[PDB]
Amino acid sequence: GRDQETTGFAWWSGNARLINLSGKLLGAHVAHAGLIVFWAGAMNLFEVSHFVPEKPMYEQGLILLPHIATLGYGVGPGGEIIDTFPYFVSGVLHLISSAVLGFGGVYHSLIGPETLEESYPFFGYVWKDKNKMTNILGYHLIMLGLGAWLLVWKAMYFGGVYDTWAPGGGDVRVITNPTTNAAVIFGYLVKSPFGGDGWICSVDNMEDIIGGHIWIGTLEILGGIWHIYTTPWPWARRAFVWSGEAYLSYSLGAIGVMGFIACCMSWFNNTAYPSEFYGPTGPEASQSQAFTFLVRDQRLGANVASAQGPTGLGKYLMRSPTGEIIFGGETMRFWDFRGPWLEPLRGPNGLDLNKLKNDIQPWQERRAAEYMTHAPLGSLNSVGGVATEINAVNFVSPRSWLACSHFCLGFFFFIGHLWHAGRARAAAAGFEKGIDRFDEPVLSMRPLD
Amino acid sequence: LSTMAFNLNGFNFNQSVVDSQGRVLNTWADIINRANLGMEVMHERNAHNFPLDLA
Amino acid sequence: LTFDEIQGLTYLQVKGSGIANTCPVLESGTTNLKELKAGSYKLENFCIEPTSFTVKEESQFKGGETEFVKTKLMTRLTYTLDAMSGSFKVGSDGSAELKEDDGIDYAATTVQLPGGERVAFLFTIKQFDGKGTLDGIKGDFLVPSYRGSSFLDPKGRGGSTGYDNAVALPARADAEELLKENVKITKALKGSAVFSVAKVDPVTGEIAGVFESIQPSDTDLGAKPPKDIKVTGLWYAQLK
Amino acid sequence: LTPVDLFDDRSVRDRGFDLIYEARDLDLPQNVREGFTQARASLDETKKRVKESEARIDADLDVFIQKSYWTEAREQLRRQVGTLRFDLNTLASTKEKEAKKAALGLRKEFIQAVEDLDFALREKDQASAAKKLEITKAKLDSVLAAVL
Amino acid sequence: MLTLKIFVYTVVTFFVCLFIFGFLSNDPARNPGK
Amino acid sequence: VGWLGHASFKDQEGRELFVRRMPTFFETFPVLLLDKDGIVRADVPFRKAESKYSIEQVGVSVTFYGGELDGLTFTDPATVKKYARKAQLGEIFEFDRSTLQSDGVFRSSPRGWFTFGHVCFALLFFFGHIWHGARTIFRDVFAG
Amino acid sequence: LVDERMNGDGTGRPFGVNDPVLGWVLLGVFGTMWAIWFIGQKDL
Amino acid sequence: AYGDSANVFGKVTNKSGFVPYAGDGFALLLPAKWNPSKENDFPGVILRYEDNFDAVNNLVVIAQDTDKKAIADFGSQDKFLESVSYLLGKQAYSGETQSEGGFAPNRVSAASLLDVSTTTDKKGKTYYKYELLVRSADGDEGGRHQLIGATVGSDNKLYIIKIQIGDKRWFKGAKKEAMGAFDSFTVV
Amino acid sequence: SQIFGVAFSNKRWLHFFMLLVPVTGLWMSAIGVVGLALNLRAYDFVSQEIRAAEDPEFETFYTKNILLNEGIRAWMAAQDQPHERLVFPEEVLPRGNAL
């Protein structure tokens, strides 16, 4: 092990004693991967064991199974779960794989050499050695590109991902014409993050998703080769801190942003996160309620078209500021919502009361009714309900869990970026420990006021 | 506050204490709920056309 | 954008464009109306896009005659009556009857007149029974209360649901404040509208023309007097 | 003071007025709430619904393609045809061994055709949509011949 | 009101450019000493 | 100015109805008329879509005994509800809110004001005792 | 219609460019700034 | 100070969710969570219970002396419903209005009969039963479900049970309680 | 001095300020609670109350908060104050549209 007397780092900063220990650092990272793979496998098998075919996955508080279901495994027409053995296979595979990674980490943390540069030059690396650092980034960049292409392969081959917008009903579909038009693929990137544009969260077609992964997959592999055969340019070296903590701070900041984006994706996107498995989105639940009553009242004998509300802005239907006909009520804020159950009734100009008056299919109703009841609203003790509700329902939208968890994760990792980045910059300057007590810069600065 | 922004409300122990036959024994939490109901039924007096405030 | 042109565009292509707040244009057809066969026809896809909203207002002079004044809309679009179905007929002569039945016949609209005064009015032709010639089909339409009985005021006092009294001031809970408290009058008013068929497309059974209507403004549930709102615009419908 | 008016709306329940309430009964199994079990139980009702979808695919849709009403055509797909895939599956399930397998194969070939036609509508290609629709009609008729 | 948009868009770009190019100006060397 | 007299609220059935008085803790209290038994028999419903205790359906009439309205009977829903709102505030007296242009809100009596001011001074003087007392005990340290 | 609006809200236009001028000005401003930064301090 | 040992590792007393209640010639299984109420909404109220929180979810058992020895004597179920319409409530609001969507002019409340039935107990007496959903312009609770059942006891007394549930709670489980108590209602 | 524009220069004053701020605040709130004991509270501004009553349209967050308080009192008094034995018919309770 190590002691503070020889490192200057206390036990609460012990892992910081592994910065220059390449061999030990390898074991630490490899081991941590084992933990991640372990949970993926363990929790998956736990979910499979606690899964029941009489209830939707979202009602069973399952988060991992929805991911496999979206990949198009053990799912059928309407999102109905045919079998769960595929899910069991995934858990078993990850769990056993975690053992291999665990052994490697333990070895590279005990028997393995504390450093590798002395023995294995290829693995041997020193922070600041930009060339080597860029090469390492390249290798991992290629790996991520291959992973994205594996998804693209599963979409156009080896079966297909589940398409909630599939024609004549939602089910797994083999993407055959993935969007490769740069304008469409990169359009999302330049889209405003505000309402309507929804930036990249707006992606509603699997064709763009698979096509976008095609673009990112290629660029990452090409970028890896570039970083493998190129060294940072003068401008970069003069505008970046070359240190392990600095490199970590860059990753911390990036992963923190990715966390926030993932939170929004799980809360707004319904394509990449099928509402059939992940449950309805906040906007989806609201629109579903308006549709549920609109249908019920219309059947009772109410003209939803000319039904003035208390404010006079239409009880069931109204016009979006843009002009599109939208459901009335506070759901006006979610007028930009788009779901496979509501699209058929829509048309060039907002909703089509013709479809609403006649052509409303029973499933369009049943689905909306189910979504309305299973809204994302919930409590920490898992007491399902808008609020001020009695303890009767035990359900919290999986979307809520992912959105809340990843948001908090992103926030902390951003704070970690600020901590590591600032310390890295201060370390480079040399004032990380504190003031010289003899070269205090302020004492040499202008007396200001 | 951010988690509650995703509809993750705080602990809900409404009607958590029940007697032998099933009668609900109210608690301080239930009293807090009574107030919450009052604020809810009042907020946006004319901005709700449906019962559930999913929004 | 003709009806078919609008149909070609997807909801996403139309979303944000604002074209959804615009009635289809009968570019085809003939300016002549004689071709329009004489008979009764379903007034489907009847749309009324208000070109301008003028409010009658006394002239600057204290005794200045009350003339309609130009105004600036404060409510982003959301003022084009559309998807309205009704009954339209035409005799061998100019006799023409235009009767609105259902659809988005109503549309709340808040416009600001010169002087920073926002005048709110429910643009609508509910229960319009025009019975003039092919052009100038004069008729009257219902003008329901801008606010419903349930609507509660800031004080909470309302029609079907409300305090009815100034709970704030207990000593003055019931007094001359009666005009504002316990009133909340939601009685509907009436307005006159005139429609004229500019062109008729017999092959596609589509008719389009100009509309002119003067309706009372919001009365704040009787709290304030109503104000004449002259709304002029274009109308499009398919006789099928 | 007026008595609340009463209306005899008992007929609403006949026209699926309890669909929403049934779908919102968590006690009912998910399949029951979704109506999947009900349809799988009612073979004649399922077969009828399938023929309704056939009519929409055959004696319809082509209209929008002719007038380039892509939005309506793409919405023509799904909607009532939305359950077609589930319907065809249960009818094929009625078959056995090779019969069921062969029927499922026809179901797949048809499902592929409907997706090709839908992509044509997405690209707003009338010529491709027209020919694709004809292919879809043939596919459905083949599946119908087997499932029915 | 496009003129207002054009002006704002230019103003924003200018300040953003100063921030990016400013940090690109060997900011790390702004250290008081080493 | 004067006393309108006692207001007697009676339902159509002839049952005497008592207007629940407003508790001090309540700035605004809902009007409720209860029988001697203590069962609400009439009230002014906030929702009148389908009331079950509406002053109208209950048919409540207010008869004033003694005072200015001595022998005066009122059946007008509005008039009865007006007196009912006053009744919940206790005896109904006539008030001239013109000479002083009253705002229509209640004020505290000199009794309440005196109690508030002296309690406040007392609480503050507690700090004064601790401060001056601490200085006396720690005079050596506070010395300077 | 009754009034005139950009009608850009809700539309996913790159960098909210509803007019070529907007796009040109953004690139022009950045280009001038880059030239100043590079001339003042060469990048590479 | 009865020395009753705590039910540590014991068995639950009642999990049926319904507590059996017995009254004057009438018996029914009241919802366990529902608490006794002290408001006589209508004349002849004998039993009155309400949900712990939402008072909209309430149950009233009205018993009125009636010469008729059979609920059929009252006439057709529709006729009887008309005579018992008072339960639905009365619209105090009288203001003329036409700005209420889904409601006829000057009408801010509408009751819709959705089901009618005439069940018979083992004893043999029949039970005029009606299911109605009352809607309001305010649309509070998304409507109020009304379960009304009536019959004449051997005491020559008409017994009427009216259960009201806010639609919100109706499709959230409250229906199960209402149905159980309504079916449990039996008159001797 | 450069980030905020002002800065402490005496450690003593800094710490004295660190202890004065919290103590001062608590004592202020205590005086307010003394007023509530006697029900002497700043519940509402009569000026806006009169304007809102005479002018129905006039509305502010202050008026909105007043309505909320009205609901809290009516929808908790029955249980929060059992001694009052207040049975409020549901119709008398203040409820907004829908909900």
Ligand code: CLA
């Ligand atoms: C992901 C969590 C994680 C990981 C992977 C590591 C990894 C490592 N830490 Mg560390 N540490 C952690 C968390 C972690 N730490 C935390 C939370 C703290 C704060 C309490 C510390 C504080 C800390 C200090 C102070 C030090 C380390 C050190 C080390 C390195 C060698 C450990 C050692 O010297 O003796 C090894 C420890 C043991 C032999 C005891 C048991 C550990 C074994 C290997 C765990 C195996 C468990 C698992 C069930 C085995 C699976 C076997 C398989 C067949 C299934 C090593 C690479 C040391 C170092 O190298 O500094 C330079 C050092 O001094 N850590």
Ligand code: CLA
């Ligand atoms: C992969 C990301 C990552 C990595 C590799 C590191 C690595 C390191 N960090 Mg660090 N950090 C991170 C993320 C990361 N951090 C984030 C996101 C934050 C924001 C909260 C911080 C905030 C932070 C601080 C404030 C400090 C470090 C420090 C250190 C160094 C000391 C290691 C150590 O403490 O020894 C052994 C390991 C421990 C003592 C950790 C003990 C176990 C923790 C305290 C229990 C927490 C459990 C947690 C609640 C579970 C939920 C997590 C999540 C779901 C929310 C080390 C090199 C210290 C340093 O001096 O930097 C050089 C230090 O002061 N980090």
Ligand SMILES: CC(C)=CCC/C(C)=C/CC/C(C)=C/CC/C(C)=C/CC/C(C)=C/CC/C(C)=C/CC/C(C)=C/CC/C(C)=C/CC/C(C)=C/CC1=CC(=O)C(C)=C(C)C1=O
């Ligand atoms: C159109 C317009 C203008 C609209 C605006 C309308 C509007 C928003 C109006 C509101 C106005 C307003 C401000 C209302 C608030 C009123 C109010 C609540 C008043 C309370 C008054 C009062 C006496 C309260 C009692 C409690 C009390 C005493 C609190 C004091 C709080 C307080 C001042 C604390 C400190 C705040 C603060 C920013 C401190 C900075 C400290 C500082 C300079 C640090 C630098 C520093 C720190 C070190 O550690 C070291 C070592 C050194 C060396 C050093 O230097």
Ligand SMILES: CCCCCCCCCCCCCCCC(=O)OC[C@H](COP(=O)(O)OC[C@@H](O)CO)OC(=O)CCCCCCCCCCCCCCC
């Ligand atoms: C980006 C910059 C942000 C600008 C924010 C505004 C800066 C506020 C500076 C004003 C300080 C006033 C006291 C000067 C007197 C002064 O200089 O103080 C003197 C003191 C310096 O310490 P000394 O050594 O002089 O101590 C001796 C003392 O015992 C007295 O002699 O500085 C401070 O106390 C810092 C604390 C300031 C607290 C800042 C106030 C925060 C909020 C102020 C009120 C806000 C109202 C908003 C309404 C719209």
Ligand SMILES: CC1=C(/C=C/C(C)=C/C=C/C(C)=C/C=C/C=C(C)/C=C/C=C(C)/C=C/C2=C(C)CCCC2(C)C)C(C)(C)CCC1
């Ligand atoms: C270094 C170190 C550390 C740690 C680290 C780690 C984290 C390790 C781990 C490692 C690992 C990572 C381990 C793991 C393992 C696992 C395993 C080995 C598994 C196994 C499996 C099996 C045996 C089977 C199972 C099964 C199946 C799958 C099927 C079904 C049934 C069952 C479930 C039975 C610490 C912190 C202390 C610090 C110091 C140093």
Ligand SMILES: CC1=C(/C=C/C(C)=C/C=C/C(C)=C/C=C/C=C(C)/C=C/C=C(C)/C=C/C2=C(C)CCCC2(C)C)C(C)(C)CCC1
């Ligand atoms: C897959 C997919 C897709 C695609 C996506 C993508 C394409 C993504 C990418 C993204 C990206 C594209 C990312 C990147 C990022 C980067 C950045 C954002 C940059 C940053 C920079 C920095 C951080 C720097 C700074 C600074 C300055 C400049 C000054 C000085 C100092 C320094 C250097 C620090 C889509 C859409 C179809 C959807 C579906 C799925």
Ligand SMILES: [Cl-]
């Ligand atoms: Cl509010």
Ligand SMILES: [Cl-]
């Ligand atoms: Cl709503």
